[PDB]
Amino acid sequence: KVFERCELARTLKRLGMDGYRGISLANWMCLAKWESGYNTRATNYNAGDRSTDYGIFQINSRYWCNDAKTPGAVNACHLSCSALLQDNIADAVACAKRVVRDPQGIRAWVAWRNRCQNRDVRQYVQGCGV
Ligand code: NA
């Protein structure tokens, strides 16, 4: 499914994302927008390392979830990558939280660094009443 902007903001807020590890809800929104366009079914296969990025947050199969086909895989979220392709994003949110508890935090996502970090992201939550 493709979440509508405010629908996702409210969902992430309900799931405890606002301020998680100091990450504002607007930053999570910016991350989701640039990673997947708010699409829970998005997948990006990287033929080089043979890993695939899954779901709304584009979490990678080499370090975070198991897709049973990625070389050098550690499954830090102890979770099937299939759980990251569900309309229900609770599993994805729990894994996203695990990712950001590592030293880099949300900087783990290159797209977020390039399109969101240090920039005004207030437009992502404006009018959502969150
Ligand atoms: Na893995």
Curated annotation (Swiss-Prot):
Disulfide bonds join 6-128, 30-116, 65-81, 77-95. Residues 1-130 form the C-type lysozyme domain. One of its GO terms (biological process) is antimicrobial humoral response. It catalyses: Hydrolysis of (1->4)-beta-linkages between N-acetylmuramic acid and N-acetyl-D-glucosamine residues in a peptidoglycan and between N-acetyl-D-glucosamine residues in chitodextrins. Its EC number is 3.2.1.17. InterPro entries: Glyco_hydro_22, Glyco_hydro_22_CS, Glyco_hydro_22_lys, Lysozyme-like_dom_sf. Its main location: secreted. The active site is at residues 35, 53. One of its GO terms (cellular component) is extracellular region. Keywords: Amyloid, Amyloidosis, Antimicrobial, Bacteriolytic enzyme, Disease variant, Disulfide bond, Glycosidase, Hydrolase, Secreted, Signal. One of its GO terms (molecular function) is identical protein binding. It is found in: Secreted. It comes from the Eukaryota. It holds the Pfam family Lys. Lysozymes have primarily a bacteriolytic function; those in tissues and body fluids are associated with the monocyte-macrophage system and enhance the activity of immunoagents. It is linked to Amyloidosis, hereditary systemic 5: A form of hereditary systemic amyloidosis, a disorder characterized by amyloid deposition in multiple tissues resulting in a wide clinical spectrum. AMYLD5 primarily affects the viscera, and the predominant clinical features are renal dysfunction of varying severity, and intra-abdominal bleeding. Inheritance is autosomal dominant. Belongs to the glycosyl hydrolase 22 family. Lysozyme C is capable of both hydrolysis and transglycosylation; it also shows a slight esterase activity. It acts rapidly on both peptide-substituted and unsubstituted peptidoglycan, and slowly on chitin oligosaccharides. Monomer. This is Lysozyme C. It comes from Homo sapiens. The gene is LYZ.
